[PDB]
Amino acid sequence: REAICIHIGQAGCQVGNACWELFCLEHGIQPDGAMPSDKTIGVEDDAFNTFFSETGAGKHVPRAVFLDLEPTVVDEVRTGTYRQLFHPEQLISGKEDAANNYARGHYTIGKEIVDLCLDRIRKLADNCTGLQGFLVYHAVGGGTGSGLGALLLERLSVDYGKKSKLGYTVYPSPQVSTAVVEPYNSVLSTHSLLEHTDVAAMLDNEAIYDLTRRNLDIERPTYTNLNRLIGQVVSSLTASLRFDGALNVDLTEFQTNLVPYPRIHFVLTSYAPVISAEKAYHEQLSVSEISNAVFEPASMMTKCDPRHGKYMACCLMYRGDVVPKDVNAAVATIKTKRTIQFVDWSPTGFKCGINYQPPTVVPGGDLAKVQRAVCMIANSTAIAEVFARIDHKFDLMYSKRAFVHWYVGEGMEEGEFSEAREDLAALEKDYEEVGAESADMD
Amino acid sequence: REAICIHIGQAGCQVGNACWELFCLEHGIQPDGAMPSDKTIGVEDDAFNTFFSETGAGKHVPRAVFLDLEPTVVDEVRTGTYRQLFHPEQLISGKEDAANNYARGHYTIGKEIVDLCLDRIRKLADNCTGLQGFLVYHAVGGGTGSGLGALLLERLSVDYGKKSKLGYTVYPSPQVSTAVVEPYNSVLSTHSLLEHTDVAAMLDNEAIYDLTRRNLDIERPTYTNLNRLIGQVVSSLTASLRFDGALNVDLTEFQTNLVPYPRIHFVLTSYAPVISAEKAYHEQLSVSEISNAVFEPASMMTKCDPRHGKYMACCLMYRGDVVPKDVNAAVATIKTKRTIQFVDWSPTGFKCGINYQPPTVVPGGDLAKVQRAVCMIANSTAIAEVFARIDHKFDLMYSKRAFVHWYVGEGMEEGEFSEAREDLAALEKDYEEVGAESADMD
Amino acid sequence: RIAHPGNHTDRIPPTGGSEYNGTVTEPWCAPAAVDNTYLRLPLIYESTTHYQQRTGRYYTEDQAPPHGMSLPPK
Amino acid sequence: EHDVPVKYIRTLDARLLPPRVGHNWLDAAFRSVQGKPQQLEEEFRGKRAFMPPGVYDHTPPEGLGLTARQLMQALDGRP
Amino acid sequence: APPTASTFGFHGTSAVVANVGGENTEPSVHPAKKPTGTFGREASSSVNPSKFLKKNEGVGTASRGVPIVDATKFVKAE
Amino acid sequence: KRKFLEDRARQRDLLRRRRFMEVEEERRWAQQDNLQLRMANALERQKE
Amino acid sequence: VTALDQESVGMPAVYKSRYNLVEKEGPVRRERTTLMLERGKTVDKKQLRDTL
Amino acid sequence: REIVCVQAGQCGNQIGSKFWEVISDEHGVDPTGTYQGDSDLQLERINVYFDEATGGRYVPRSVLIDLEPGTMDSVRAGPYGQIFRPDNFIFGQSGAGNNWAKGHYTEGAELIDSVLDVCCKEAESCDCLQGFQICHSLGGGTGSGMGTLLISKLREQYPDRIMMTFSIIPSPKVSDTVVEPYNTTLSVHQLVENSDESMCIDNEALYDICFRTLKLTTPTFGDLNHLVSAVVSGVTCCLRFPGQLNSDLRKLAVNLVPFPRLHFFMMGFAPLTSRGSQQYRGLSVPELTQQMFDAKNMMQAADPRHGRYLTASALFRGRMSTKEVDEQMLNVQNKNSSYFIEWIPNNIKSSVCDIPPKGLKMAVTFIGNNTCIQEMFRRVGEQFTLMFRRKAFLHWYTGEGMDEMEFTEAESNMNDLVSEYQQYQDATIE
Ligand SMILES: Nc1nc2c(ncn2[C@@H]2O[C@H](COP(=O)(O)OP(=O)(O)OP(=O)(O)O)[C@@H](O)[C@H]2O)c(=O)[nH]1
Ligand SMILES: Nc1nc2c(ncn2[C@@H]2O[C@H](COP(=O)(O)OP(=O)(O)OP(=O)(O)O)[C@@H](O)[C@H]2O)c(=O)[nH]1
Ligand SMILES: Nc1nc2c(ncn2[C@@H]2O[C@H](COP(=O)(O)OP(=O)(O)O)[C@@H](O)[C@H]2O)c(=O)[nH]1
Ligand SMILES: [Mg+2]
Ligand SMILES: [Mg+2]
């Protein structure tokens, strides 16, 4: 039933702002936390419970923490429109950033703030009766997102144990770039995400820019568009928990169906009707068309082409007015395709979900209003190509020790570069080996 | 039931404008895609389905793509009157032309644009349930039409396999000419048209100019007249799919009856009641008169004289108020003539089709309104003279390597000219051999 | 007879479709540029295919909606 | 009503004709003053310049619905 | 492998959407990346009267008859 | 048959009207040329 | 998402959750079931033959 | 698809001022720079020659170079001068002296870096760059020397684009400059290596057009530069307006140039006729074709009857039938068949554009590739040999620093060009 969202650093807080805007507007909670008396929701209803708790006077408050080392973004949240919605204890801010150093966040600065984060998260977890995982939003390119995200995932994994941790991560884009030191932070980051996450979803800003230029008709996109798309995706994935449907899918079903081996937990994500209002009225939108859409690489939110690898498992979430015959016909058509290939050890490649609540539309010009949508999470060996470009950039920089004195000065051994690069190399070799056909019976 | 139209370059897009104006006006779809809301005929018939799909919002949208390398013509379509009819993705335009080089289209420039075309064709073929072929309109005299048309037909032929591909092709006129390098492009084109088309219809603008001067009373014709005639021909051939009739003819019956050997697939086309409104009141226009008309060489849309060859098969499509007994009496009258000759191995020379829907009249059009029409496509050995003039002009020009440095600079081996010229020579010898009497039994 | 009326008593009456400004529904208006006063602007500035797209569904060009001098026709 | 009025036919003005060969009434070689200016040097030294005015239009859009107008409008402890 | 169906990094060329097929190719035939662009080179030092232009020593371009496209890592259509 | 005959009649009438209009149009093109010619001649005389 | 049928004063037309579905689809399905049960008890062969 | 213009020397700057007047009129840009046009068709391709400045205004994508600002000072104070960007005027401190070596080596190398910086700054802003366009005279000093210097640098930097030149060439009867043969020979050597397509115009032909055809009482250089601006704006018309059969600079080059050295062309423009005669003959496609081949309307001193046409191109502007164009081009080829090279089956390309120049119902521009151009090069080579054998003025060029070996190379290259034209003229089928 309940899930708690943890937002770290700049990207994670801004995406959290867009997400909570969406979840408020879909349930109908006023920005003051109340609910107007003219709505037909009913006082008794419970669907909000996944994301809000009431104090008993009927105000709503959300199950989230916002974590940052610089004040500016959280003070922006504090002075914005949702000021009265959040409890002030939930908005935690340090004094100064981790300055794009993973070492500064992990060793020097995050160590001071981390115990406050655990005390607030504990205060949330004590006010639950069916917590079924943590959702984490961060970028691995920056210093505090990498360092405090890793440290916090380690501490959470010791303290909470078996509870599931699902990550949405903004990875360094393959040719769009914002800072020089992105490869070092991403390599050092991937070791912690490897050990301390149950499923990891990969996002690239260059892909969401491509999707908003190509599919939407936006000449001048900004981060709010990308964050609204991410919010729509999370709302689609959690809708299966919150509303009635023909074939429900509990959050444990994603991990059970999608993950074949305990290390093979990095997944590709895509969303079908990313379409503008003018295009949406030019096209019919049947179940099979959006199912065909989620498999085109032009639809993906991570910059990888799945045609260079093999799928192991797919999980398809349908929400809205959909009928099982269309889901079955679509999956059989996908299976028919020749450019879509599954590993021969995974014959039953698909998991389905069907929910009656159509996706909510948030005021503005970034998505049409539609009666049905499908969202996909899939595990594929193609992801090894995504890591290879970071490793090439790391090798280029590390060949001259271009910046290492900063990292060594803030507390890290030089050995950690070689260790992390060898561990990510082993992850590539794992994806090479798992994708090798079973030619042992010859 | 369904057919998909592919329009390439300038001639193919301009002919597309006339085709879709006619198909809209024949079905009754308004230029904005919405049928008249007050027009309650009584039974909403399915006949549109051959050419239109509905957007679920109840708009009709057509099963076509428009392909060009220069923006101007597609942007003209985008800004015209039919803006709302087409889906914006269907109108694909590049940045710069293939500059009359087949080599530039095939090797350099079309290779960039071809994958978008394949994605659109994929999106169309997924929205069908009884697709039964592709119709392609292009000219082989220009650079992008030849090079990208060949490249696209090759890719379609590998991906789709057995699916039929029917071409409408604008060939170089025997003495009217528009560009110097036409022989090279036509020679290089014919190898691909030979391998990768099931039936190819040949057109020359000089014949349609003669027809518009002689039959219609137009002193100064322009391309819109020719394009309206071509649209009428295509509508006549596809009418057998769309309206009630006595003897229907599916496109596979056409292919089965018209093609005797797999290389012998180049056909002549003609159309009978090309007549002005003032002429229409001096003459009755019975079945036998228009049947007699389609066999006169003054009626043909290609500059060849069929009296210089032998017919192998004829396919006669009648639309409008015709009775089968009159078709039989007409065909029996044709058979008596001595200047019409069939190869002795083809005794049963005719295929018939009979449809009840009369041809539509277009408000700005130049054709009269008539109760019946017939359209003929026929396979004949006379085509061998058509190939011979290109081969002579190629030999004259190529003897001095007049322009070859352009082709070699844009990526082509000089050897490719000689290979193509030898392949067309073998096709010429095939048409010489098939027409040779079977004097082996003596 | 239209071209060379001469001194004939049986002159052909005008059809009423042809006008200098090109529109049968709007009067003459002064152009923005001074050098464009003598020109027939609505007729010069129109592509051929746009003309056949607009005028195709009418037996007669005066029944067509006015051009409007706009990039998407009015 | 559709023809050009007589105020533009019964005058003598050279601005009504577009530029072309043979339209050489208003050009050099006929001016009364034929002195050569030193504009560039003065411009690069920064004591004379040209700067024409621009045009800006402030009309509001028409036909907006109720929701669009509401979207435009969107953008003490006492009991 | 270069990224597929991207809208970044091919400004100034004839491409609209780069590398839809996902193969090992350049985004466009015209050079997306060049030695020098807007910064320019030194042309004052490189012109001398003692190393003048010789007969048939002009710059080799596609119009002259030299296949420039074969010198770059752009995959041609087979 | 009767409806077809009426449709053919109205089509022929409208084509005749269009054929008249083109001949009406050419003279207005001529007038457009004439105005510029007259103004140019007047300006030349003034310069002389 | 607006309702299929007009004259619906409920702004959240489609909010089908667990509680909404039980408390709205209980009475309507029960009413349909009891109407089917009582309405089919009085069978009339003559009237059925007349309709046929 | 954007073109960058370069105007060099006195002739180039003067022709450029009239060209940009004509272009600003066609797109309805006021002399203040404000858009004041009356159809969207004018606006929708304005990018081809203009960049957009803020609140309405458009600025023209052109670089002006000269060694003394006098011509540039006049155009700036001229009636359209304000439109030009101030940073685009580049000037030195001493003249070219009509000497190629001075213009190429001493002030050329001094200024050239600032010109290349401006051209690169302008080129890298385009989303897709079409060829460069340069107007200059070959007989002058800064025009010839700095034009060919800049052409060489741009050909090093942009070898995949198109290179186009418009060039003024010495009359056969009277010289405007004494040292014309040296500057012409060296410039033709540079162009024949570097250029893709070059158009040549004789001032004597423009004088004969004005006096004989138009019967102008008092012609001025504004009229000659208007004739040049008319043909120049006509060749590019299909780039920037819709039409029934689009055409492009590269397609013209592909159809016109049989072999890469043969890229020098003759020019003509057809609708020329005096105001008195104009009442006697209506415009029509037969009339345009007859005028188009009529020597009254051709801009060179050489006559086609002494050579043969390899190729020709005609660009038509206006609403007209394609049938009439095709049959006219066939009839001219059939009736005059001895003047067309017989081993090419059709020498003429046609193109049709919807939008005529203002105040004309229709117009055509003609481009011809004819072997009679060999007589011009032969005459220039003769005059060069006469001067060089006697060292007539050579000390100026040698004093600037040129090796005499440069002169013998340029002479040899021109002689080989003449031989190549003569060989292709007399080829036969056998
Ligand atoms: N999608 C998305 N990406 C963002 C957003 N903000 C930053 N990024 C990206 O994330 C990377 C920068 O990471 P940051 O979040 O700024 O790093 P940080 O967590 O603030 O770490 P510090 O700089 O030490 O405080 C760059 O690739 C940005 O493009 C956002 O709001 N949305
Ligand atoms: N019937 C007819 N013929 C046309 C039309 N347009 C062009 N042609 C003819 O087709 C040939 C020219 O082919 P194009 O279509 O112009 O070549 P292209 O496809 O544009 O190729 P590029 O020039 O490289 O862009 C000539 O013979 C023209 O006469 C048309 O609209 N109708
Ligand atoms: N048609 C034309 N020719 C010109 C013009 N100005 C100069 N010329 C010719 O160009 C040649 C002189 O070259 P010039 O431009 O003075 O060379 P520069 O000194 O290097 O700038 C002579 O043949 C002049 O007749 C002009 O405005 N129009
Ligand atoms: Mg930060
Ligand atoms: Mg083209």
Side-chain angles (χ1 to χ4, degrees), chain H residues 88 148 179 218 229 311:
Chain H
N88 284 33
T148 57
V179 296
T218 53
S229 300
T311 62

Side-chain angles (χ1 to χ4, degrees), chain H residues 9-11 14 98 137 140-143 168 176 180 203 206 221 224-225:
Chain H
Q10 198 207 9
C11 180
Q14 287 187 5
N98 279 14
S137 68
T142 182
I168 308 307
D176 300 332
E180 276 163 2
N203 279 306
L206 305 182
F221 291 104
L224 279 80
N225 297 352

Side-chain angles (χ1 to χ4, degrees), chain B residues 166 168 199 237 249-259 267 314-317 351 376-378:
Chain B
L166 305 93
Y168 289 97
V199 181
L237 181 157
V249 182
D250 170 23
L251 298 188
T252 60
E253 303 187 58
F254 193 40
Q255 191 192 209
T256 302
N257 284 276
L258 198 68
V259 179
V267 300
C314 294
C315 181
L316 286 164
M317 304 285 198
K351 169 63 168 175
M376 183 186 75
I377 297 181

Side-chain angles (χ1 to χ4, degrees), chain A residues 242-245 355-358, chain G residues 13-18 20-21:
Chain A
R242 297 179 295 138
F243 298 100
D244 196 348
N355 195 269
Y356 297 124
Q357 181 68 3
Chain G
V14 184
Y15 196 61
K16 64 192 61 203
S17 58
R18 282 88 164 93
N20 224 327
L21 188 152

Side-chain angles (χ1 to χ4, degrees), chain C residues 33-51:
Chain C
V34 191
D35 49 356
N36 298 8
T37 46
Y38 290 163
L39 309 185
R40 316 183 68 191
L41 303 164
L43 299 191
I44 304 188
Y45 294 98
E46 191 178 31
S47 85
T48 307
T49 76
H50 276 154
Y51 174 80

Side-chain angles (χ1 to χ4, degrees), chain A residues 10 68 70 97 144:
Chain A
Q10 189 152 19
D68 207 343
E70 61 197 310
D97 60 358
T144 191

